[PDB]
Amino acid sequence: PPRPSSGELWGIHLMPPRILVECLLPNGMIVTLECLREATLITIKHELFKEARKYPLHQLLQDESSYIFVSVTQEAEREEFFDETRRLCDLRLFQPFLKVIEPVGNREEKILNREIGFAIGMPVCEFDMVKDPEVQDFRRNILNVCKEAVDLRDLNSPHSRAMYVYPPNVESSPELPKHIYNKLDKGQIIVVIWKYTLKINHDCVPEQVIAEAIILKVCGCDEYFLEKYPLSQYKYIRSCIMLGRMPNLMLMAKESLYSQLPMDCFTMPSYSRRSTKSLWVINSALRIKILCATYVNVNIRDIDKIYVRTGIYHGGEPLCDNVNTQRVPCSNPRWNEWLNYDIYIPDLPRAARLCLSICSVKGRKGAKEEHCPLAWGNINLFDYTDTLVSGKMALNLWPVPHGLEDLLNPIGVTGSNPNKETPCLELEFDWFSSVVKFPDMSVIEEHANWRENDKEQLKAISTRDPLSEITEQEKDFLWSHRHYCVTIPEILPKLLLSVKWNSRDEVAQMYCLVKDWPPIKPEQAMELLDCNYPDPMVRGFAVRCLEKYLTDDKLSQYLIQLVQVLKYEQYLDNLLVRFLLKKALTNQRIGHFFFWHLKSEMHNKTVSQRFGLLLESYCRACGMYLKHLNRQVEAMEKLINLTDILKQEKKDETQKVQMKFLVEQMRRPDFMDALQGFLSPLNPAHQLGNLRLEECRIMSSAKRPLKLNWENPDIMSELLFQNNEIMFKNGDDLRQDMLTLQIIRIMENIWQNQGLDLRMLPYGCLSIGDCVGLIEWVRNSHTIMQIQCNSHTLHQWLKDKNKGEIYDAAIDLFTRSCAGYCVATFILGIGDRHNSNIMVKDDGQLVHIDFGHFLDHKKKKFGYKRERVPFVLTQDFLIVISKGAQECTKTREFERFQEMCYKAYLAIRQHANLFINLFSMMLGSGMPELQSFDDIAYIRKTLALDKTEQEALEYFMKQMNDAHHGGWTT
Amino acid sequence: MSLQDAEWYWGDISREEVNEKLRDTADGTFLVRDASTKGDYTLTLRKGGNNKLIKIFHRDGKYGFSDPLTFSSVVELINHYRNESLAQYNPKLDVKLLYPVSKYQQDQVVKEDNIEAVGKKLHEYNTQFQEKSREYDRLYEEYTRTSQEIQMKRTAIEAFNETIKIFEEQCQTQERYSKEYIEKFKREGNEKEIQRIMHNYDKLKSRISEIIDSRRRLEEDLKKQAAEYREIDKRMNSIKPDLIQLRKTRDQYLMWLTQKGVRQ
């Protein structure tokens, strides 16, 4: 299993300087050898065999070179140590013993599987034990996606290999926004190539900038202009235009970089080598027998009885009324009751699922009896081979997620709980003298073939948001004109909601429409991948939309949600996972975050097997980046062990003692080798060179986070950044703030495209495990309280910092930063802000930290049905925006500030479909603030989607006035 | 009669409040509210474990689900389909308006007319709710910590099992290689070498006995912690129903306080 901790031995976070190691020689003798904690295996094996001569039977031992060490790791694996250059303290030994054996088997294969198992955080050999045929078929069948990528990666000789390692970080469109283009001089830009300054067009290709010299690279990082994209379309150049920065670039020879490409080679693994009645033929109703359960955890006096709640679901919607079993006492969980459902079997859709749970009923207060779910479990009615389930089945149930109050959990994952020390419910499906299977699409397409006022409605229904109300009349109206909807393709989601999914007649027809349905925009296809659209044909159409029109930067921008929706898939082998794996294997910038998003949830047993199999297929084909990923993993593992020591055994010591311990440990050889010279997980284009120990320090806070500082080893590191600072957090769940920063980054993208330079600083934030993550440290930033350590204090600090002509630049940045944050926080409902949640840079850039909760998180604690204004511009912030002018609300600067907020609020409102769908794709993520579609209703109110666009602006203006106590006017 | 005095009319409630009022209700349960757009009337019906929205259009004091708008009042429109099926309107919906959700029962929770009496009671309930909320959140931490440490211990026990298998393989290995050499030294008279082999074997057996006893102590810890998990799990499955009802009672007293005070 995954490691319990990150220490050097079980129960020991750090080995002593010297330690006794029991060595088991192949002659039966056991030798007790004292080793240095940082000694290598090639040295330990040398001292062991000189000491072995002093013991019996030494003669029948072979040469030192004929043996290697084996031991039990903290993952309970018997790992053979083929790399004898490893240190004793880095072996992750369970106990301090080593066994001597002769190496056997396919050595190169065992070395790869160990490297893959290290990156995964789980030994690859555990997948071989899995009896489930769906798991094994996934491991073998998924390889063709691996083969495809490595083939498309080395067919263009060096070029194709480079585009993989250093893809171009470009926009989705070369069209330049108006406010960005106006910053250019007659449609050209001045660039400095390393000093040889030159002015050239913005539409010019990098090759013609090279011709202007009389491959390119950004100074300070590993970003390369390897494609003929318009120089403006590159994100680095596009950003320099907006911020007015001088684009410092570097030129070099393509052979100087092509030599550093390692000719990635993929090798087929070992597991690659080593009557049916139609569903429409069945003529009976659907019935399931709830046989028995083993136990439930609840005391007999505080709960009356228990029962099993079942229901047939198609995504989030039930296909028929839920059916409960009889109520039995807690001690006798036995039913053996054939539950009958109001659904005809041939009408069961392909994605039909059974959702059940063991509930506790306690009727002891008035007539209202409380029902609480104790455990839950979901089962696909059709397996991955289109086979309807039959016979008896045992299912181990999951704990109810925190905050879930519903009696069933259809959003949850299907399959049994791998933890067998849980309640187990035995079921029994009926049989029809043969196997039952879903009919093939060709053998069903025959079943389907077997005005103006209306145009104004259909168009208006497609403009609605994905969560807007849909009456039954509008469903019949949509179903009646389902053939005229092809002219308005964007209406498909609303149309699919109008289908009677518990009817084979209507489902078959809808299949023929999506088969020849024109592709929709990617941002609209992502909706078809959430928990509301489970059908394979529907999800296949969505995948094909992404395959044709989803650019790599939008894929990287939406990667979080696209990974989360993998949990909704019924089966391991689906088109979505093949598409995502392919892109991860053809773009390393995508693969890097693909790996870390999966790795960060390997602790979650609901998805560890799915994400573990996907990670195996990826690491097995990602080429030489597996080496760099392992370097990142072991770096994080030592930071986890360090912070675990500080917050466990040394939690009752002063910072003077802890820092002395920190600088002592960080100076060790094993620690410097692991935490120096590797790529930053926040951005693999950033090289984390050597540590600046004088800047590293334990943060004086309760959670004891660590601020770390690395040198940027890039030759031209002075042009961009010389210090690379990151905060390492171990204890706080950062998924919510990773999501919030992503949404804010998406909001800024919408504003820049609509010609609104509401500059935001979306610093990096990445969750790498359970309550462990990294956060990019913004340089030169101080909290508003730190600035105050008077109303003009904040304004004088920006005056003292930026003086003269720099004053106007800073005030503009502070004002444009409030516009974005003011609008984004109100829309999302971020936790209330204060002088510690808000920070400012020396240049005026505003930075909010620790967003925390979002949406109506206070409605449950305090039942106040009101939309909050989390960021209220105090008098301090209004003075800065007004350039020090009293009557700040009446200033021309404040009028332009309101115009930004108004335009930004409407801008996000106009793209509300994208944001509703993004949250909808996170409903199964596990964030208690985002569990049901009713939690997403908060942004439908803040964006005023049920009102006209003018009413929404009036609503936003009212919220701002009621929070700032007047001053907002139009 | 008026629509305001009708029980199944709720005025300005959201779709989410309707969902909770119709959660797990039997087919036929219904209620009428104003439009979210704010026909100005939406009928919500329970059917097949879903909540079907049926819009009530209004043209020139005439009401109906579709034109021709036959009915003249929402009350007459509701009562008619309370006694006849909806299949005559649309065949997909083959049910009647049978079980009404009344605003009368919602007024039964609060039992105090005085605004000072409701406010005083609201403060009591909201105080209890925060007490039980902080209690629940503390139990959840112990629940998560215990669950994680139980998983850690079980993995360690798996590691103990594999370690013991390796050390027991050493004994068999030493037994195989010895005996052959033990017999030779016996004829060769080298009794000192027999004792060195016997001493190393005793050294291996004692280490094995210690590892076995370390696994037994860990298994005893796992047994105790697994029992503590079941007890924490029970204490949470008991306060979860009480915390829900306590929050809903708190929310209703808030509803009573808002409706009884000045509004915009």
Ligand SMILES: C[C@@H]1COCCN1c1cc(N2CCOC[C@@H]2C)nc2nc(-c3ccccn3)[nH]c12
């Ligand atoms: C990375 C951020 C932004 O760049 C500046 C440094 N930095 C932070 C400084 C920061 N402190 C500065 C003021 O003194 C208190 C503390 C040492 N407290 C942060 N809490 C978080 C954070 C963010 C997301 C989720 C959870 N916690 N980030 C923080």
